[PDB]
Amino acid sequence: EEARALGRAVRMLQRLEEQCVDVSPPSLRDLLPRTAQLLREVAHSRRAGGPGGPGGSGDFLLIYLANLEAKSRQVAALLPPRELFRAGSRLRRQLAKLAIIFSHMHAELHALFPGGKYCGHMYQLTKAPAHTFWRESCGARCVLPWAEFESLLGTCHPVEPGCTALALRTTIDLTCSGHVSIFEFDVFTRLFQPWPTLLKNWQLLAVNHPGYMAFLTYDEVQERLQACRDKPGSYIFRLSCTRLGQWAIGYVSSDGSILQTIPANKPLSQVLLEGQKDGFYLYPDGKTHNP
């Protein structure tokens, strides 16, 4: 049932781990066995729950496992039986993007079933109003399909249907599963604080801001900023993979070095203004027009 699902997903990540035996986060060779190990722990703890019904622990696992399988098939399809170094290598980018997604699915699973043991009914968000929004709208649930989440979020922060809502969905759905967990919502509301202007912060900082990069790794940021070494004060920003919920700002320093920093942890709008004023964050993605 659930146990059969969990056995299948374990063996599937072991296959991928063996197919990856040919580093620096996010690393598939690290994430796959850690995710497998956590799933072994989930399997044993459920053979013993939180409140059942829609969006409880069982629902989360069903959705999570069906997504993990889809993503594992994508990875499997890029790997030979037992070139990454060509410029513009499609294989390198697809693997990098998939490693990002496994990094997020590993973090989400660890947040909600640490040691195998479900805590989605007790989970507390980092920002208080976001916490209160979730629990007053979704109760003890830990996950929602996008459409229901969109509808619920709209009681407070409505998003224009169509292109904008899909852009929002892409930003929030870190695991690319079509569902929003309490964890994902935690991550989003930390990144785009403060709460009273949530979606306007998002519009300004992500949709309309040339410095915003989605689904880039640390090494992809170092590589992109190569183009800007002669432009001190060029910068971009993206979600940290190792510190989920925090921004990683990549910038070109005074000496043409490419540095990356985590500004723990005020609204990004304030970090940006303060860098602008001081002369560190002047040219988003190397371009003239700082928003």
Partner: peptide, 8 residues
């Protein structure tokens, strides 16, 4: 070294 000090 990976992530460096916030240059504020």
């Amino acid at each position: 070294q990976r992530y460096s000090s916030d240059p504020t």
